[PDB]
A paper describes a structure:
Direct interactions between PH domains and other proteins have been reported, however, structural insight into such interactions has been scarce. Although all PH domains from Lbc-RhoGEFs bind activated RhoA, the binding affinities vary greatly, ranging from an IC50 of 3 μM for PRG-PH, to over 150 μM for p115-PH.
The electron density is well defined for GTPγS and Mg2+ in the guanine nucleotide binding pocket of RhoA. As observed in other Lbc-RhoGEF-PH·RhoA·GTPγS complex structures, the activated RhoA binds directly to the C-terminal β-strands of the PH domain primarily via the switch I and switch II regions. The structure of the PH domain from p114 shares a similar fold to other PH domains in the Lbc RhoGEF family. However, the PH domain from p114RhoGEF is less effective competing against PRG-PH in the FRET competition assay, with an IC50 over 60 μM. A closer examination of the two structures reveals that the interface between p114-PH and activated RhoA buries less surface area (approximately 500 A2) than that between AKAP-Lbc-PH and RhoA (about 570 A2). When the two structures are superimposed based on coordinates from RhoA, the β5-β6 loop from p114-PH is farther away from the comparable RhoA interface in the complex with AKAP-Lbc-PH.
Numbering used by the authors:
A (entry chain F): 1 to 181
B (entry chain A): 299 to 411, 413 to 444
C-alpha cells in the first residue's frame, strides 16, 4: 500500500554482506546459508519521517566474473548502497578502485550510500587476532568516513545484518537519498 | 476437434509465420520460419506481454522450443518476430536464468548470458501462470543441447 516506489541497487565485493543486509531488511531474518549471488530482486517497505515508501531491492554479484551482468541492474536506479566489510580492508580498497568508477559510469547522478557491513566483527577478539597475523586490522569509522568523502558519497553508515545494529538506519538514509530529485 | 498436440501446434505456428520475417539472436545469427521446423520440439507456447522500456505492455506469442525461446507479434494475420526495444526476440536457452519480479507476482525476468547479456521482463496472466512458465523454461534450459 505504499504510494511511493523507489529502486535501490546494492554493489560491493563478493562476500561483503550485501544479500544478508537486503534479506534482514526485507524479511527480518538473517539467511544462514551463503549462496553467491548472480541476480536477485526483493521488495521491502519502510516508514521514514512519516513517509511510507516501497523499495525494490536489486541484488547483484560481487564477483568480477559477473561484471557484464551487473549493468542489467543499474537502469533507473534511485539510490545505490555501495558496500564493503569492516573485517576486510581489501574490500574498502576496492571501493575507489572498482565500485566507484563503475557506478559513476552507469549511474552518474545517482546518490551513493557508502556502507560498512559486518560491524559486529570490529570488536570481535578472534577476528582482530586473525587479522593481526596478516598485519591487518578492522576498518575504522574514520577510514570509512574518509572514503565516503573521497568518492562523493551522499552518506556513510555502518551496520551488522547479523545483529541488526544499524540496518534500519542504512535504509532510512537510503530512502531519504532515493526521494531527492 | 483433433486434440492439441505440441508438434502439430509448432507446424501451425510456422505456417502462420511471415516468410519474410526474421528474428535476431544475441550472437548476431537470425532465426526464420524454416528454423522452427528443423529438428525442434515445442515445450510450451502461449500469450505473454513483453514490458518495454517505455513501460508499454506489448502482446506477444511466446514459443519455447528445444534450444530457443521465440517472441512473436501479429501483423496482417501472420506472425512476425517481435520488435521491442531493439532487443533480440530469439533467446538462446543456454545460460538463461529466470527470476520472479518481487513486486509483481504475474511477471518474470528472463536473463540471458558471449556477446553479452540481455534482460526481458515478461508478464503472464497470473501468479499460477508465472510459475508454469518459469518451470517450463527452467526444464527446457536443463535439457537444452
Ligand atoms: N559476522 C557477520 N557475517 C555476516 C554478516 N552479513 C553477512 N555475513 C556473512 O558473510 C557471508 C557472505 O554474506 P552475503 O550477504 O551472502 O555476501 P554477498 O555480499 O551477498 O556476496 P556475493 O553474493 O556478492 S558472492 C556469509 O557467510 C554471511 O553469513 C554480518 O553482519 N556479520
Ligand atoms: Mg549476495
Amino acid at each position: 500500500m505504499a504510494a511511493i516506489r523507489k529502486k535501490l541497487v546494492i554493489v560491493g565485493d563478493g562476500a561483503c554482506g550485501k544479500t544478508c543486509l537486503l534479506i534482514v531488511f526485507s524479511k527480518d531474518q538473517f539467511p544462514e546459508v551463503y549462496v553467491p549471488t548472480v541476480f536477485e530482486n526483493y521488495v521491502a517497505d519502510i516508514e521514514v519521517d512519516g513517509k511510507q515508501v516501497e523499495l525494490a531491492l536489486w541484488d547483484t554479484a560481487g564477483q568480477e566474473d559477473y561484471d557484464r551482468l551487473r549493468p542489467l541492474s543499474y537502469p533507473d536506479t534511485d539510490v545505490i548502497l555501495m558496500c564493503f566489510s569492516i573485517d576486510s580492508p581489501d574490500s574498502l580498497e576496492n571501493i575507489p578502485e572498482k565500485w566507484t568508477p563503475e557506478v559513476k559510469h552507469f549511474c552518474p547522478n545517482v546518490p551513493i550510500i557508502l556502507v560498512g557491513n559486518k560491524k559486529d566483527l570490529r570488536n570481535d577478539e578472534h577476528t582482530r587476532r586473525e587479522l593481526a597475523k596478516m598485519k591487518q586490522e578492522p576498518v575504522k569509522p574514520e577510514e570509512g568516513r574518509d572514503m565516503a568523502n573521497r568518492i562523493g558519497a551522499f552518506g556513510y553508515m555502518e551496520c551488522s545484518a547479523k545483529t541488526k545494529d544499524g540496518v534500519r538506519e542504512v535504509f532510512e538514509m537510503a530512502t531519504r537519498a532515493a526521494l531527492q530529485a | 476437434a483433433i486434440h492439441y498436440e505440441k508438434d502439430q501446434r509448432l507446424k501451425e505456428i510456422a505456417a502462420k509465420t511471415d516468410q519474410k520475417s526474421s528474428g535476431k539472436l544475441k550472437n548476431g545469427l537470425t532465426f526464420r520460419k524454416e528454423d522452427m521446423l528443423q529438428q525442434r520440439q515445442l515445450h510450451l507456447e502461449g500469450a505473454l506481454c513483453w514490458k518495454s522500456t517505455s513501460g508499454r505492455l506489448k502482446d506477444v506469442l511466446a514459443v519455447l522450443l528445444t534450444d530457443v525461446l521465440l517472441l512473436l507479434q501479429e501483423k496482417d494475420q501472420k506472425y512476425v518476430f517481435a520488435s521491442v526495444d531493439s532487443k533480440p526476440p530469439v533467446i538462446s536457452l543456454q545460460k538463461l536464468i529466470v527470476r520472479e519480479v518481487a513486486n509483481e507476482e504475474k511477471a518474470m525476468f528472463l536473463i540471458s548470458a558471449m556477446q553479452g547479456p540481455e534482460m526481458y521482463e515478461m508478464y503472464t496472466s497470473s501468479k499460477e501462470d508465472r510459475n508454469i512458465w518459469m518451470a517450463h523454461i527452467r526444464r527446457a534450459v536443463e535439457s537444452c543441447p
